[PDB]
Amino acid sequence: AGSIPGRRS
Amino acid sequence: AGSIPGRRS
Amino acid sequence: AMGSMERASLIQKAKLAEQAERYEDMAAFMKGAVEKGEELSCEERNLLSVAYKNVVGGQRAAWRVLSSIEQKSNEEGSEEKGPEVREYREKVETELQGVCDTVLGLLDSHLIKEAGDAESRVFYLKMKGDYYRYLAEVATGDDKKRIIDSARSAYQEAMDISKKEMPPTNPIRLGLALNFSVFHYEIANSPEEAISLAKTTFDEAMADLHTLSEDSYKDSTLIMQLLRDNLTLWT
Amino acid sequence: AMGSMERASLIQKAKLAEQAERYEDMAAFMKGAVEKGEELSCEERNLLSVAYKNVVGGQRAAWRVLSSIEQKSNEEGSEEKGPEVREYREKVETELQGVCDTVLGLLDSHLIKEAGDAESRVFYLKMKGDYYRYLAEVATGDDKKRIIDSARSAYQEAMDISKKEMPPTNPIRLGLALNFSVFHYEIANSPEEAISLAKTTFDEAMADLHTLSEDSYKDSTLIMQLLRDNLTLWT
Ligand SMILES: *Cc1ccc(S(=O)(=O)N2CCOCC2)cc1
Ligand SMILES: *Cc1ccc(S(=O)(=O)N2CCOCC2)cc1
Ligand SMILES: [Ca+2]
Ligand SMILES: [Ca+2]
Numbered sequence: 289a290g291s292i293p294g295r296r297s
Numbered sequence: 298a299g300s301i302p303g304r305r306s
Numbered sequence: 307a308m309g310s311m312e313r314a315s316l317i318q319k320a321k322l323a324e325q326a327e328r329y330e331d332m333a334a335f336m337k338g339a340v341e342k343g344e345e346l347s348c349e350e351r352n353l354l355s356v357a358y359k360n361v362v363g364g365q366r367a368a369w370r371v372l373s374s375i376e377q378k379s380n381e382e383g384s385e386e387k388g389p390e391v392r393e394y395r396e397k398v399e400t401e402l403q404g405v406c407d408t409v410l411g412l413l414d415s416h417l418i419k420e421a422g423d424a425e426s427r428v429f430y431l432k433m434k435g436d437y438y439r440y441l442a443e444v445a446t447g448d449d450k451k452r453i454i455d456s457a458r459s460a461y462q463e464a465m466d467i468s469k470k471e472m473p474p475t476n477p478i479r480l481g482l483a484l485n486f487s488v489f490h491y492e493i494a495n496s497p498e499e500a501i502s503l504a505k506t507t508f509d510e511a512m513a514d515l516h517t518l519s520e521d522s523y524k525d526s527t528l529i530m531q532l533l534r535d536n537l538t539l540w541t
Numbered sequence: 542a543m544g545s546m547e548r549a550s551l552i553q554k555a556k557l558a559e560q561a562e563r564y565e566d567m568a569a570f571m572k573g574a575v576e577k578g579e580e581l582s583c584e585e586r587n588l589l590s591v592a593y594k595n596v597v598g599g600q601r602a603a604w605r606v607l608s609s610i611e612q613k614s615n616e617e618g619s620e621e622k623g624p625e626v627r628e629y630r631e632k633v634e635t636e637l638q639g640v641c642d643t644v645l646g647l648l649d650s651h652l653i654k655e656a657g658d659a660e661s662r663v664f665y666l667k668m669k670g671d672y673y674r675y676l677a678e679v680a681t682g683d684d685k686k687r688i689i690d691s692a693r694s695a696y697q698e699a700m701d702i703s704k705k706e707m708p709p710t711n712p713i714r715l716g717l718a719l720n721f722s723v724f725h726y727e728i729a730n731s732p733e734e735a736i737s738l739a740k741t742t743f744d745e746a747m748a749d750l751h752t753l754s755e756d757s758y759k760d761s762t763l764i765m766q767l768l769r770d771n772l773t774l775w776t
């Protein structure tokens with residue numbers, strides 16, 4: 289299950 | 298130009 | 307932190323650190339920017355979030371590797387290896403908890419209380435839910451339940467505001483629902499709540515896509531695909 | 542460093558850190574193991590080398606990103622951005638130099654002087670050449686020439702020993718020649734020396750492959766391919 293990757297602006 | 302990667306034992 | 311550096315210089319260096327993939331530096335720069343005491347712009351909030359998500363993302367990945375090795379060592383027929391695996395898992399776990407506490411401290415002092423607009427308040431409350439969720443992933447003692455309820459409460463307040471104040475296609479509203487659904491499935495042992503939330507979020511966004519420009523359509527459909535990917539895995 | 546932890550526990554945790562991709566931890570554990578004062582086994586030398594190569598590898602990649610941004614800022618028609626890019630490049634550069642100094646300090650106190658076997662002595666001297674080469678990559682002042690000669694001298698002593706004491710297919714002998722050829726091409730402005738070294742190394746290894754087992758053949762041909770890849774790029 290994937291959350292928001294959120295690792296690139 | 299590549300040196301030895303050398304980043305995995 | 308970084309008290310002698312100008313706010314604008316901290317922001318500029320956070321962007322440079324992101325380009326250099328130096329996420330610990332990026333987080334320290336953005337922590338310094340927050341501690342200047344001024345509210346954060348939309349772009350600045352994203353930099354703060356990206357920085358700490360990368361830092362804790364690496365810690366969580368390491369913790370999972372070590373927890374898996376530790377669990378195998380405690381099975382039947384396993385040769386006693388000593389305290390080292392547990393000790394090192396505990397070290398990584400303590401470092402991860404420290405980063406989560408640092409982010410939660412920034413939100414509590416004083417990002418959330420000064421966030422009056424829906425876009426900023428929902429963003430910070432989603433962060434609060436996320437970092438309590440990361441604490442919940444490693445919690446095993448007398449406060450696992452309280453940590454879970456802290457995550458749930460933050461996510462719930464963000465959801466209530468986002469439903470009242472944002473369109474169903476808003477990327478922050480969509481990412482909040484995505485992560486809250488992951489919370490339900492992975493943390494709260496409520497897979498049916500997770501599936502229902504993801505489905506309703508996807509369907510209500512789909513019905514609102516007609517209002518969007520080409521660029522906004524791209525932003526919203528990207529996150530809708532993540533909701534669909536989870537539903538495919540969960541059903 | 543890590544004075545209260547057992548040598549065997551440091552080694553065990555270095556292996557766990559590698560599995561968790563926690564290379565800073567891995568390097569600190571192996572630094573502690575070295576400072577116990579006992580010589581290192583073949584496997585332990587590899588752990589030390591892998592740990593620091595990953596740490597300095599990330600620093601070098603970041604330094605190159607920032608140096609490129611800095612060079613673009615100092616071109617014609619570029620808008621003045623302030624001291625931030627230079628300051629942050631300098632910060633990363635200083636951290637990188639500190640790691641190289643740390644490794645060189647471990648080799649000097651006292652890994653190299655206690656290394657009597659060809660396999661250990663060549664391994665450490667190759668490391669010494671490598672970390673002076675990394676210092677040379679960022680050097681611009683009064684000691685760039687001295688740093689380059691320190692790298693050359695370490696590589697040359699390792700080459701002399703490896704030619705006398707190891708077969709032409711030995712993976713450490715091959716990796717040493719590979720990296721020395723990179724030194725010639727990238728640092729010493731001697732591309733013809735780099736090409737000649739890579740060619741002679743490849744041809745003499747090829748002629749020795751018939752002596753090897755299936756597993757040793759795989760080890761040697763893997764590094765021979767790296768020599769060929771460079772020759773393809775250089776010619
Ligand atoms: C939590 C979350 C939700 C959405 C996004 S994003 O779509 O990638 N985007 C939102 C605002 O502008 C830039 C990032 C990230 C995180
Ligand atoms: C510098 C160098 C040379 C060779 C190697 S390796 O072939 O990957 N191998 C050598 C000894 O045993 C394990 C690693 C690494 C670095
Ligand atoms: Ca100021
Ligand atoms: Ca406000």
Ligand SMILES: [Ca+2]
Nearest residue numbers: 546547548549
């Ligand atoms: Ca002991």
Ligand SMILES: [Ca+2]
Nearest residue numbers: 580655656657
């Ligand atoms: Ca000896």
Ligand SMILES: [Cl-]
Nearest residue numbers: 393394397554
């Ligand atoms: Cl530990």
Ligand SMILES: [Cl-]
Nearest residue numbers: 319628629632
């Ligand atoms: Cl800086």
Ligand SMILES: [Mg+2]
Nearest residue numbers: 424471472473
């Ligand atoms: Mg609105």
Ligand SMILES: [Mg+2]
Nearest residue numbers: 659706707708
């Ligand atoms: Mg021999």
